[PDB]
Enzyme design. Structure first.
Site, PDB file in Angstrom:
ATOM      1  N   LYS B 180      29.176  28.670-118.372  1.00 58.22           N
ATOM      2  CA  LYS B 180      28.899  28.298-119.981  1.00 58.22           C
ATOM      3  C   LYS B 180      29.560  26.978-120.269  1.00 58.22           C
ATOM      4  O   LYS B 180      30.791  26.999-120.545  1.00 58.22           O
ATOM      5  CB  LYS B 180      29.089  29.112-120.790  1.00 58.22           C
ATOM      6  CG  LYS B 180      28.596  28.917-121.967  1.00 58.22           C
ATOM      7  CD  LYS B 180      29.632  28.513-122.964  1.00 58.22           C
ATOM      8  CE  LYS B 180      29.260  28.036-124.324  1.00 58.22           C
ATOM      9  NZ  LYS B 180      30.307  27.600-125.353  1.00 58.22           N
ATOM     10  N   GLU B 254      43.717  29.786-119.468  1.00 61.56           N
ATOM     11  CA  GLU B 254      44.652  28.666-119.442  1.00 61.56           C
ATOM     12  C   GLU B 254      44.642  28.046-120.753  1.00 61.56           C
ATOM     13  O   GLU B 254      43.504  27.670-121.171  1.00 61.56           O
ATOM     14  CB  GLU B 254      44.207  27.818-118.078  1.00 61.56           C
ATOM     15  CG  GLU B 254      45.017  26.600-118.385  1.00 61.56           C
ATOM     16  CD  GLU B 254      44.327  25.356-117.284  1.00 61.56           C
ATOM     17  OE1 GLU B 254      43.059  25.828-116.891  1.00 61.56           O
ATOM     18  OE2 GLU B 254      44.786  24.201-117.354  1.00 61.56           O
ATOM     19  N   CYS B 293      46.069  19.651-120.895  1.00 60.40           N
ATOM     20  CA  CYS B 293      46.681  20.867-120.978  1.00 60.40           C
ATOM     21  C   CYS B 293      48.239  20.503-120.931  1.00 60.40           C
ATOM     22  O   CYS B 293      48.990  21.330-121.667  1.00 60.40           O
ATOM     23  CB  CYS B 293      46.329  21.901-120.341  1.00 60.40           C
ATOM     24  SG  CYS B 293      46.499  21.687-118.581  1.00 60.40           S
ATOM     25  N   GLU B 394      50.094  21.707-130.513  1.00 58.61           N
ATOM     26  CA  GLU B 394      49.511  20.749-129.490  1.00 58.61           C
ATOM     27  C   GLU B 394      48.579  19.711-130.229  1.00 58.61           C
ATOM     28  O   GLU B 394      47.877  20.289-131.492  1.00 58.61           O
ATOM     29  CB  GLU B 394      48.666  21.579-128.414  1.00 58.61           C
ATOM     30  CG  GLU B 394      48.496  20.931-126.985  1.00 58.61           C
ATOM     31  CD  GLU B 394      47.783  21.707-126.170  1.00 58.61           C
ATOM     32  OE1 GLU B 394      47.433  23.081-126.622  1.00 58.61           O
ATOM     33  OE2 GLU B 394      47.804  21.676-125.014  1.00 58.61           O
TER      34      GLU B 394
END
Ligand SMILES: [K+]
Ligand SMILES: [K+]
Lengths: 455, 498, 499, 203
Positions: B180, B254, B293, B394
């Site tokens: 997806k 993750e 990331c 972040e």
């Protein structure tokens, strides 16, 4: 204690779990290198006692390799635990027999031997074969089988540490062993066998004894048993001498590593390369350190260096030392034998000698097996690599530096096999001694199975 | 043609080896973030096409998992060969849909994806079960088997890398995949599936587009999947874990990270190539617009070299070239979506008003021409202390924060002071400092005298509130597999008790 | 000192940080022996505060014990195993008394397995090495094994000390400090083992906090101060624990009960030789641990045209099971771990009776006379139906086995796989192809071929469909308690080129 | 002379070939396998071993044995250097060695196309049948132990306790059951550099 002769008398062979006397009655004397005083009588096997050993091995071979890996490992653990609580006795036996210091035996030889036993008991538990799924129908299985009988010829350098280093993998893999200890330092293995041997099935640990040309030659050349030292640089870069805090002390202490176990080690750091920009101060402290070594009776508490191995050891060391002195090998300390007095006159001591020269001299391309170090100098990292790789050897090397790139590039460029970095002479288990020794004493069985009635 | 359109205007749902229109008939417009324009219509799917994908996957799983591992590796090698022959088309698609520099897709992304498909086709050939002899009568045989059908929710910031970071382990391990793609970048995966559609057998790869509440939850909550892999935002990860905690389904994650980058004053010892490399590694926050990331957005510099390091690093940041990401030379590109700018600009506002002095940047990057509607923010450097939100949240922006320390113990303190444990970078020449900093940093990956290297053989992961697992390694082949333990006994004699 | 004398004492407090500390409150529940339902001591009731003390001690020892070298921790584990092996009788008596398990079963299989498990994991700790990867000439990646820090484990009561050791050996081999929650059915065995060996481990490496599974299980699972939660138990509590530990992002490792098939092919009775005796042994193995095994063979699939001989001999040999005081060496089957479980198996027996399945033996409770009346003894029951009845599709945890027949191999696979669990299975046959095909086909984590109930350390063990996550009793339990630290080091001072 | 100049070229290349990344050598091997496919049960296995040994090279790690908190042993997998060896065997040999980073010294037609891909200087049993040497229960035997003491191997049976016993009891290295290449090759043309590093400043 250490001052009471550990040895009993009249040690005979050890075959099949019982003390078997020689087929042809003979007993060579046990001359302790510490004083040259006869301390026992050792069996002199020739060709028949080795065949009795092979008989006991081939008779206990089928039932021992059939034992579970877990039961085998538990036997090894019991061996190690009985070796531990008797630490002083085996250490004293090895000191009396070989002349190594008593400080250096209850700290670096026995604990290493017990830890080797425990370690290879631990690698057998974790050991596995392998399955390869060829397809949906065909599978390949790979089992680990014992070799059978393996004969081991122990050197005289560490007659108990090396004996265990060669036994524990061979017994973990499920083999029966025939041992011939070297006649220079026998019968410490006899003491160890008298301590443990019943823990193994009769015929698993066979220890014949005698002479290399007498006992070993029929053993090492036998169609029954399936299977049967150079110059190590100690490079010091200018990095190590930034400050006099704790790494320079460690650097000097690692320089004086020829004088641990009297340099008979096959990886002896007997070739020291010091950076020109630090040579003066480093050699100041290094000479202050080597002359601070306390030579004396190996078996007291604190003698840093003891008797060598024999008379032949002293003749070789003295010959090489004189040959060095001729061609110009400026002696900063030592340079002869050492008569320590008292009972210590028949011994075989050599005092720690710092040589000095260049890698052209024959003291650099020839190995002494003695406390004799050959200092030299180099200009940069490339010259350090050019010199440190100038030898017909490479059993080991040592790099001291406070720089990450320097250490890695040296370790990967040096053509040694075991490069120490900011340490030396650390011989721990699981570091290649490594868990891949168990494959030395193992063969592999491959079974390819097809689960398909049609083809 | 990089400047030519690479997308068809009708991307349906790839399901069962064929292009399937959505049952609901709806669609959504795809926006290129380079200009803000429209580039096609992509199928909007819901819990009805999710089930179509699952049906195709389950109808193909039994035939896929019975193929030899040497047949599942030749197909992977052919996939890599096709992806390498067409590296520009995929690079151009990942450029148009994601708006990142063409150099970063022809240099990092596509070579890394091809390398992964080769690597996990290699790891699969050398894989072997274990056979644990127990005694002469009992042997335990361990076999590796596919998990079945796995569902994967890849994130936007790496449309074709995070898609190939997880397909290759999953297809190597013999599973059938319902993938997806993130709605923010749903076209690159479509072109990629177009070019290698026929290499896989029908149903092994099934790709369905949609938003995160209509096509994401049905896939990530089904009882027909064995495992759900997710990559992205932490709250979405908690949503995934809650949804998959009903069928007791593995949930490998993750989830972002706030990675520091430490400099120990050993770099400024000669002003040599190593100092140059440290300077270059500082500016690495600008790589992929900071929406990686493992972003170095926290920078720790030894108190003795802060002045020199800044007076050269600000220069090298001001030398970062921005522009249209589609020719050969732009270094910093465009954000993926408009909401990405919105979040980053809100964060920049918070940083500006918190007390983080702005060393450089700090606003949007209007580039004029056919780039005004694009999504561009200027690479930014602030300066504060670790107790400020820009350090402890972040951003995914081309933003980095800088603070100093006294000594190595303080460096470990500050580098572990965050709540995320993904990555970190260490810059020193001393071996002991490098090792103690690598081993004391509570992060799954530590870079020493380098940064943003993603080799296929180095396990990538983090161990804090930053996910569960290890990518880019042969350990990840076992995350899409399960062990069959057949413990056979060969002695035909009873033990002696019921 | 003796098997028939009490092996516990009163007021087992919490073993927190190498100490014996009372709970925050004087809440003390009561342990009760299944053998003769009666008090065998008073056990501390643990609220969340005791979990906080346990986690504090575990974190201090996490700091220190974490960097203890692998050879030191393996030495400590070897010494622990040796201490247990020299006190096997005391531990086995404690297990019999607290669980109701036969002293035969404990002394034969349960304590030797725990000692072997500690020795095995000390070994695999010594043999464990990390990894290196030469990326290029100038860049190397170093993969270090690291402790997770502090882990929490909730152990079941069916195998109190065996599962305690199965979870503790890999956890402390890996350098993880443990907070350990015993099941409140069997709290006092782990206490005896702890006061035995609670001086070989540094304070805080092992903490054991005893309480009720809701008063103390939830606070342990609902904590961010643990890097992992391990669980073995019922699927309802498994889903609960998955919820609590998914709200915190900490990984979970479950092992939930499964309805394990035990297939008997028509070849086991060909020559009715010692292999047939072994197969009948394996059939009767449903009553091992009084059926309270997460892998109990409580669903036997006998091939259709061998059913006559096998069931006549097997019903004979199941009647031959000697039921008695579990503390007798001759007793073959003990008590049920609790009265509530006895009621559960009784209700499932009644459900099976009401669902049209005949009873071949057993079917009710048992009063073994004397003090054993208070105990909870279910007679070994054999049912007989098909795969569609509830007792074939629902898990009992009692000495109850349900028997059906299959025609050929395909029906064997269909019946074996038609369930919601995949924890274990057993395949008895002499054909070589049949054993492998049936072990590959069966969706079970472990498949026993021509044996059953063998749990030797260094064989993997896990749930394959819905009955748990991960593997146990294998060297990769170490990896379930370790994290990988990647250190990517560049030895090139040359700039990358981009930026 | 001719062999001497081959050796000289091999050393000159060995200076550089051992520096090449495992990924790059594996990629070169995959390109070799592709090119061999284009010009294609001997070639299938040759190509298959090229792919397989590229795979094992990509998989190979090396150990990082942790001796203590302050001491680590690293076990790198350095190449040996120059080594010397139909075409299937040629490949079983070259494929591992080239994988490990060794400049071999030695098919001709194959060497013509393969050579350019590599940088210059790099390339220059009883048969038992158990009733359900040919040991039919050609010769004959009586029982399991009979054919055990008579006697890689090969064992047809179905008892699943004679296949195992007869597969384990044969003193050989390969037993085929109901029928009739390994990573360990890559570690035969490849040597281990052990680097024991101590990270403690004190002594
Ligand atoms: K987009
Ligand atoms: K109880």
């Amino acid at each position: 204690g250490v001052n009471a002769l550990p040895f009993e008398e009249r040690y005979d062979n050890f075959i099949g779990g019982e003390w078997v006397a020689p087929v042809s009655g003979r007993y060579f004397t046990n001359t302790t290198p510490i004083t040259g005083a006869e301390i026992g009588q050792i069996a002199r096997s020739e060709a028949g006692d080795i065949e009795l050993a092979l008989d006991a091995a081939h008779a206990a071979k089928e039932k021992w390799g059939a034992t579970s890996p877990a039961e085998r490992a538990n036997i090894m653990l019991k061996i190690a635990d009985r070796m531990e609580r008797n630490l002083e006795l085996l250490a004293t036996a090895e000191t009396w027999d070989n002349g190594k210091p008593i400080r250096e035996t209850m700290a670096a030889d026995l604990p290493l031997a017990i830890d080797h036993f425990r370690y290879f008991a631990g690698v057998l538990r974790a050991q596995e074969g392998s399955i390869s799924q060829i397809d949906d129908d065909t599978v390949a299985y790979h089992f680990h089988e014992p070799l059978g009988v393996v004969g081991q010829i122990i050197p005289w350098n560490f007659p108990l540490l090396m004996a265990c280093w060669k036994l524990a993998p061979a017994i973990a893999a499920g083999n029966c062993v025939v041992l011939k200890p070297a006649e220079q330092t026998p019968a410490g293995i006899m003491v160890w066998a008298n301590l443990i041997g019943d823990l193994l099935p009769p015929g698993v640990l066979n220890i014949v004894n005698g002479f290399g040309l007498e006992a070993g030659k029929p053993l090492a050349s036998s169609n029954r048993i399936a299977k049967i030292g150079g110059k190590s640089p100690n490079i010091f870069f200018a990095d190590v001498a930034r400050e006099d805090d704790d790494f320079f002390d460690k650097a000097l202490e690692g320089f004086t590593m020829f004088a641990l176990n009297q340099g008979e080690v096959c990886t002896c750091p007997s070739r020291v390369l010091i950076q020109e920009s630090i040579y003066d101060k480093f050699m100041e402290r290094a000479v202050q350190r080597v002359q601070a070594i306390k030579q004396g009776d190996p078996r007291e508490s604190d003698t840093m260096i003891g008797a060598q191995a024999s008379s032949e050891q002293k003749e070789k060391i003295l010959s090489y030392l004189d040959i060095g002195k001729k061609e110009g090998a400026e002696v900063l300390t030592g340079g002869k034998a050492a008569d320590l007095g008292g009972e210590l006159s028949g011994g075989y001591y050599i005092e720690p000698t710092i040589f000095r020269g260049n890698n052209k001299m024959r003291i650099f391309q020839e190995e002494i097996f003695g406390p004799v170090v050959s200092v030299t100098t180099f200009k940069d990292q490339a010259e350090a690599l050019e010199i440190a790789n100038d030898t017909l050897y490479g059993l080991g090397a040592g790099v001291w530096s406070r720089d990450a790139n320097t250490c890695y590039r040296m370790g990967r460029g040096i053509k040694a096999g075991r490069v120490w970095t900011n340490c030396y002479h650390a011989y721990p288990a699981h570091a290649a001694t490594h868990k891949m020794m168990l494959d030395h004493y193992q063969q592999t069985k491959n079974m390819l199975v097809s689960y398909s009635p049609k083809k």
